[PDB]
Structure 1
Amino acid sequence: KKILIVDDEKPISDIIKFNMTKEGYEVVTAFNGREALEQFEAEQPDIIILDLMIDGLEVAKTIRKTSSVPILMLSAKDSEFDKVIGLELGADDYVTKPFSNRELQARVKALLRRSQ
């Protein structure tokens, strides 16, 4: 399976990339909203992890216009408002930073199970 990691911070992109690779996923990366949409269209990932630091919300909105691909939002923002609007804009899950590497793996697995 193929995971698109959309993160504008290289250190954390690198950790998630390393951990998903170790799990056997093919990883593609994007570091802004434009690259996120370009990579989504060209690579047709099975799941998207979305951690941009309002741009993330538009990315997810735009993807949902044409695709049901699972989106796992990842964010340092952990308020009720933040989680609710991420989910309403089309996120399938929302996970806060800092996160457990094992939990992130488990949640990616759960999402992929649920979308085939």
Structure 2
Amino acid sequence: HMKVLVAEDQSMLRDAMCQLLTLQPDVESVLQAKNGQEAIQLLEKESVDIAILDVEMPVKTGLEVLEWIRSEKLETKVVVVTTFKRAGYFERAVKAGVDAYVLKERSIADLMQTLHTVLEGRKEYSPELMEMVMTRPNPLTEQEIAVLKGIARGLSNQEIADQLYLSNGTIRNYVTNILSKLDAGNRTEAANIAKESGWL
């Protein structure tokens, strides 16, 4: 039956994921890698049905591995695990068609449960992440977003104004509105918040 890849740089996480996979009835073989470049190389070697990929791997991250798998059109389901709650990581993973996304708030047993969900053909985005992050969507208007992108690119207000055909005045306002909606102290915090959040 199933061939499963674990790519996980933390020795205890890796060994525990592998050891619980050996108890799953529909698993016939387990492959492991401690970084993303090693994971890609095993994917060049062997057919894999499902892979667990840790976003915090060195060399190449689990998001890069996911993207490579999808670029290659491999018939491999992908479960990504991460400690971080940044929506930007989640967004990046959704853009590459991740099958499941799990936080390290979860146990190894929970992770196995997600593995079966994905094997039965369904996606599974972390409930608790969705509760924490998705319930606070981008409040910015299309214009406010265009301004914020300007700021993140390092533009001044006059520069932003000229590009958009608007008064220097109007831009500082937009900025004021952005800082308020994002409860941010300055232009830089504002942009950081949107970049971390994947608001571009």
Q: TM-score w.r.t. structure 2 length?
A: 0.53
Residue of structure 1 equivalent to 2:118: 111
User: In 2 relative to 1, CA 98–14 (structure 1 residues): closer, same or farther, beyond 3 Å?
Assistant: farther
1:20 match: 21
As a proportion of its length, which structure holds more strand?
A: 1
**Unaligned ranges ≥5, structure 1:** none
> What do you get for the CA RMSD once the two structures are aligned?
1.7
Mapped to 2, the partners of 1:64 and 1:42 lie a distance apart of 16
Contact 1:32 1:52 in 2 (8 A): no
Corresponding residue of 1:42: 45
Runs of 4+ aligned structure 1 residues displaced above 4 Å come to none
Secondary structure of 1:114's counterpart equals: coil
- TM-score where L is the length of structure 1: 0.88
1:16-70 alpha-carbon deviations (Å, 9 max, x no partner): 0111111132210011111101111212110000004262222111111121411
Which residue number in structure 2 is paired with residue 99 of structure 1? 106
Q: Secondary structure at the match of 2:106?
A: coil
Q: Which moved more, 1:98-107 or 1:35-44?
A: 98-107
- The reply on whether 1:82 has 2:110 as its aligned counterpart is no
Greater C-alpha Rg: 2
**AA aligned opposite 2:40:** L
Asked if 2 retains the 8 angstrom alpha-carbon contact of 1:5 and 1:50, the reply is yes
Provide the identity percentage: 28
Give the length in aligned residue pairs: 115
Larger relative contact order (Cα-Cα within 8 Å, sequence gap ≥ 6): 1
Tell me, in whole angstroms, the C-alpha distance in 1 between the residues paired with 2:100 and 2:31.
Answer: 20
The letter for the 2-side match of 1:58 is E
Indicate conservation of the 8 Å contact 2:55/2:80, yes or no: no
Point out where structure 2 has 5 or more consecutive residues left out of the alignment: 123-200
Separation (CA, whole Å) in 2 of partners of 1:17 and 1:34: 19
The residue type paired with residue 82 of structure 1 is Y
* Distance in 2 between residues matched to 1:33 and 1:83, nearest whole Å: 18
Answer with 6-15 or 93-102: which moved more: 93-102
